[PDB]
Amino acid sequence: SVLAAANPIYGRYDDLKSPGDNIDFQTTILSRFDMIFIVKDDHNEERDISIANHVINIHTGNANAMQNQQEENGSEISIEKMKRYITYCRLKCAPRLSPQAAEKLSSNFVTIRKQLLINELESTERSSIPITIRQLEAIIRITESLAKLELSPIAQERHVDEAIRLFQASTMDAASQDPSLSEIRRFEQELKRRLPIGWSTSYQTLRREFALDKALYALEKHETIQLRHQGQNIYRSGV
Amino acid sequence: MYYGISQFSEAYNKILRNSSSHSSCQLVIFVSCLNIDALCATKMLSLLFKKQLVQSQIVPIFGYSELRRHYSQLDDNINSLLLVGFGGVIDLEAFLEIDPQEYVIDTDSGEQSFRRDIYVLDAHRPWNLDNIFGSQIIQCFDDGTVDDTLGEQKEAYYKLLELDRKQRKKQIHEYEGVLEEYYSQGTTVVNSISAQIYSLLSAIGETNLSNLWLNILGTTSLDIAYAQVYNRLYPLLQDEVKRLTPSSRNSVKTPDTLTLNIQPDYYLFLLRHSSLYDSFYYSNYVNAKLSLWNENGKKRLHKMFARMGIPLSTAQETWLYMDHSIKRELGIIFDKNLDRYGLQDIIRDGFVRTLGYRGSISASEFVEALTALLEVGNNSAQKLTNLRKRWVSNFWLSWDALDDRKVELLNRGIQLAQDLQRAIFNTGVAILEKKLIKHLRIYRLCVLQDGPDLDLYRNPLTLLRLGNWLIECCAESEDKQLLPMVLASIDENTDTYLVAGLTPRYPRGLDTIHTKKPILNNFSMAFQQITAETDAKVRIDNFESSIIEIRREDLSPFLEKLTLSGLL
Amino acid sequence: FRKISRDRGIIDKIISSMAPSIYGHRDIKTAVACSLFGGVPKNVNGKHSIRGDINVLLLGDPGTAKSQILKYVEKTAHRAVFATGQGASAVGLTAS
Amino acid sequence: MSLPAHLQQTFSPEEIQFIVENEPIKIFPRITTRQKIRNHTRWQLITTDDKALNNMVAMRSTEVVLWIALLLKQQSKCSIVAPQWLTTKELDRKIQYEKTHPDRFSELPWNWLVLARILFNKAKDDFHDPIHELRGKIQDLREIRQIKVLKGLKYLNESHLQLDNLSLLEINELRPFITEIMDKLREIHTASLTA
Ligand SMILES: Nc1ncnc2c1ncn2[C@@H]1O[C@H](COP(=O)(O)OP(=O)(O)O)[C@@H](O)[C@H]1O
Ligand SMILES: [Mg+2]
What we know:
This is part of a larger assembly, with chains A (239 residues), B (568 residues), C (96 residues) and D (195 residues).
Chain A: H1 19-22, H2 27-32, H3 45-59, H4 62-73, H5 79-92, E1 96-97, H6 99-123, H7 133-149, E2 154-155, H8 157-175, H9 181-194, E3 200-202, H10 203-209, H11 214-221, E4 226-227, E5 233-235
Parallel strand pairs in A: 1-2
Antiparallel strand pairs in A: 3-5, 4-5
Helix pairs in contact in A: 6-8, 7-8, 9-11
Chain B: H1 8-19, E1 27-32, H2 36-51, E2 56-61, H3 64-73, E3 80-84, H4 92-95, E4 118-121, H5 129-132, E5 138-140, H6 146-149, H7 151-163, H8 166-182, H9 193-204, H10 209-220, H11 227-244, E6 258-264, H12 276-281, H13 284-290, H14 295-308, H15 312-315, H16 324-327, H17 330-336, E7 349-355, E8 360-362, H18 363-376, H19 383-401, H20 407-434, E9 444-448, H21 460-475, E10 485-489, E11 496-501, H22 513-516, H23 523-532, E12 548-551, H24 555-564
Parallel strand pairs in B: 1-2, 1-3, 3-4, 4-5, 9-10
Antiparallel strand pairs in B: 6-7, 7-8, 10-11, 11-12
Chain D: H1 13-20, E1 24-27, H2 51-54, E2 62-65, H3 66-74, H4 88-100, H5 112-122, H6 131-150, H7 168-192
Antiparallel strand pairs in D: 1-2
Helix pairs in contact in D: 4-6
The structure holds adenosine-5'-diphosphate (ADP) and magnesium ion.
The site of magnesium ion has 2 residues of chain C, from helix 4.
Subcellular location (chain C): Nucleus
Protein name (chain C): DNA replication licensing factor MCM2
Subunit structure (chain C): Component of the MCM2-7 complex. The complex forms a toroidal hexameric ring with the proposed subunit order MCM2-MCM6-MCM4-MCM7-MCM3-MCM5; loaded onto DNA, forms a head-head double hexamer.
């Protein structure tokens, strides 16, 4: 198994640039990897305080006590024990999918490929992160590993649901990164002038007015509108 | 006196008559955990009652609150109670709410009998005169102090008891002064409970090698803080070892022979279970005599090892695998090259027990292993109870360590002892480098506010271990005059401190007239007096009287009032 | 060493004594002194390892004694190696 | 079901010890229950003879059931006398017999292993011979008898087998193998002889 750590060009991700510009790896090499994690520096104050307080505890000797206490509490496993457990699981269990699990995996692979197709059609450019049959086998392998760690001879739908969640959190997240313009500007101007600052309009009405309408999501980023009633109501948040 | 030395057999026979019924379990033994002497005494009692098939229950109690709660929970069928390691310094009938009229049966005919007998069994000398003299339910296993050194107190107590003009009032105040001067005395220890129970066994005739070994362990538990007591009791153990060892000496070793021996047992730290270098380095006495805490101490140690001609590679080798040339010349080498550094007191005679082919072990090492197992074996008023629960649980680990079939637990205890001594050394060098001990004209305070592994010191035994380290270091410094020391350790989870008022002691091996008079720990009365007024959420429940748990915010005013208190 | 370390303001003396024949640049001297003394390399439980050495980057206009400070550090430090610009390949910097 | 799987057709070694503990043994009492001519509770048991228990005289050898001898030896109230076969001379004689006749077992009592273990554990100080030598000879006898068994389990036919002089614990530990291999070699034979 290959666990490879890389770095996008320019060091930082630079989400202003296209997702294909940050990653210099070819599609062929990127297709082998089952899960392609793209982590980012959130620069969130509440998370930064937590990270700082954790790192300081690491430095000021507090780790040698806290980790030992957690391990003896039973919420952790020492390296010498996890290594033996991993060897035992690998030499004892090789789970195979149940038919209900296989139906879920197929119906999810179709959804994933449809989403990739619509993203490619919208962007009119092949996605840098590929989704192929090798990724269906990747989800199969993740499901079987999740079942294996429990020594379950057959992989239920719980493992399929968790494997699907893991794939969505890693490779779909990597592939979903996004950077016409005249239509976006027209939509923003017309809804700013028509829909007042303090009121709300329903989305079916905006559809009648008319697309994918990513302009509404962009405005939601700018905190000028807000979809509240389960997406059925578009409310001008006050900007 | 209540029960002298010569009449322990009377108490044992009374216990047998009252509660040696196979129908039920009418005997309950209350043992104070965090006390090796009480642990060995209770092991002796357990073996003795196993021989006579006397059903009994052994309860480890940590504090006085637990004792009161258990006694309240105690059923009325249980007609024999043993308190091991505590109860001799408090008004037990008052503390437990005991009135003799509700426990008396068959009052008639100059005799009295009671439906429950409480036998207190401890070594702390401030005997409560209402226990040793003015109560029949409470029966104290005296060691001969009361019948010889409490005549004046006996007369003073009885005169006031019987008497309920100017001459009468003056004499009452004179007698009441005798009682008062008897109190306001620090709590010391004169004897070992293990030796007392071994004397009882000698009276009954159940002595054997295992009981003698438990006696040796209990006595050697006192050598660190009460070396005068250990030196007093040592000749008796030396005679007993000679008496019990079989005449078939110099025989070949067989996988069944158990040998108690009196051989040179140097006063190092786990010498046989760790390297020679680590035995010197982590020894309390060597540290005091060389000041290894500073940087120059390690250089002094290396220079000493070079002087003896022991290579550092050989010195750091594990004691089992040390070359037989060096290991067989330790006595000669130590004779030649120890008086130079003032470590002549390192050479000593101790007891070493070998069980067949399992290798030697000395009582000094065994008690360190037992202590380690007691200490680290496994919103605010609840987590503390969880700590008490774990502390009670560790008592059974230390108890099972005594069995010869659980050597795999004694080895774990040895490893824990080495780790705890390492942690104690690290915290000691951290305290002595930052100069945390604030010198005063009353008591040298020292508060642990922050650092590593500070959760080790919420245990009273580990805190006492660190305090003994510091006190040994200070005792060998001539400039530093003798003065009580205070240690505190903040518990972050409960936001409470653990103040442990200690006592100073003279340098080991220094025998003088003032050394003969023991030093008395006056912190108990001071703590109780300060807590009685000025409510400060102080928890005075430990059998070790000079240890309290105080709130984080209330610590400083408490220490201020203690400074204003001239009791100690 | 132990006698002069107890002095108040020993850090300022040490900093001021880095490049004695180079005027000003107290921030650079402070950074170089910190790098020369270094930090403590941690190792948590034998699994997590934290770097314990301080890296310094001197970026500035020409003729500001950046190379002279480097030459001084080479003179002072115990084990020092000097490599420059294009005259240092990838495998000669690390291992070949 | 009512009887666990590991207790189906064999005896657990605890049950073998239980069976052995019912055999009489000779003891030297440290008490005296013999009522004098000039109260007291008598044993009056129902699965053995109480006559030798109500008439114990200190240091006068009697015979009591083993599980009672052990009960008294729990205190210091008796002293179990080792059987004559449990001495170094007799063990050496039996070892010589085993080394001399490689086709048949020696005539050790059926409970020799169980009795040796029980007496070594509970009566370790009642042997006229050093126990460190009795253990070393018991182990030697066990090793020789194990060598002879492994060379006779090479004769597991489908008709029968004569394991003469074999002990009870050895038979108990060999039962699930011998009695389940011979069953299969018998099923094969009966299947062949279906004509
Ligand atoms: N602050 C300063 N004090 C003394 N000399 C300086 C100073 N700054 C620069 N110099 C002189 O400038 C000369 C050239 O410096 P150089 O090593 O070329 O710096 P750089 O490589 O950054 O251009 C040196 O001989 C040095 O003596
Ligand atoms: Mg330059």
